[PDB]
Amino acid sequence: KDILCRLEHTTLRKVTANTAIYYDPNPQSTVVAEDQEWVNVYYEMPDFDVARISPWLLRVELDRKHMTDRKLTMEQIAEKINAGFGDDLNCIFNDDNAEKLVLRIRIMNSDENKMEVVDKMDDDVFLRCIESNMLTDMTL
């Protein structure tokens, strides 16, 4: 089962259970959600520059039954989220012991390196783009 779990094209579409795109301007208090203790790791580095993360949260929840047979851990899901996209995006994930599925993607400003015309896309729409591309096309 496990050595040949490395097949079957597990895509985040069937691993996830829910999703939600939120507006959190200050992450320290996720007034939109009910998990503020996870923010305590927004204390050293969200890969850099807390002052330049976009305020749009993409809360994705991952069913644990679907995830427990493939055993594809949120550590590995995090690895793939990093690798496939890089540092343009970000992430921070709960432990598995939480029993409440959660993982959150944040879009670094992408002007974070260097800061008024027709947009690439408003970050609102562009989070509904990484909510399809990553949901169907990512190969976990």
Binding site: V118, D119, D122
Partner: protein, 127 residues
């Protein structure tokens, strides 16, 4: 009183838009402007230019199905019932805004089409 030939109508609004609410002070009619001819949509206004204009198109089935008499309170001794000549529902329009009648025939959302735009870029064009 039947000899009198004043023909009653129906002015109906959707529960969506706010009803007259008596904030309508004085203006409630125009029936002909829709020339482009005896029967054409009404085009109504609101106490002059400033207000929320709207149009009423008639009802297909009003009399053939079942006639709708209008029994009135008639504060006098008697009561009266009038056959409704026609029914037409009013929809708020005349755009209360600017309309893009040419739009340079844009691409249908295949391009980025950053939303909340093409209407803030516009209203800046033309001052």
């Amino acid at each position: 009183p039947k000899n009198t030939t004043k023909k009653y109508n129906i002015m109906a609004f959707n529960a969506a838009d706010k009803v007259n609410f008596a904030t309508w002070n004085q203006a409630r009619l125009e029936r002909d402007l829709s020339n482009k001819p005896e029967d054409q949509p009404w085009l109504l206004r609101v106490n002059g230019k400033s207000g929320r204009k709207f149009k009423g198109i008639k009802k297909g089935g009003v009399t053939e199905n079942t006639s709708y008499y209008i029994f009135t309170q008639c504060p006098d001794g008697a009561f009266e019932a009038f056959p409704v000549h026609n029914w037409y529902n009013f929809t708020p329009l005349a755009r209360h805004r600017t309309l893009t009648a040419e739009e340079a025939e844009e691409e249908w959302e295949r391009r980025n089409k950053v939303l909340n735009h093409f209407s803030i870029m516009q209203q800046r064009r033309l001052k």
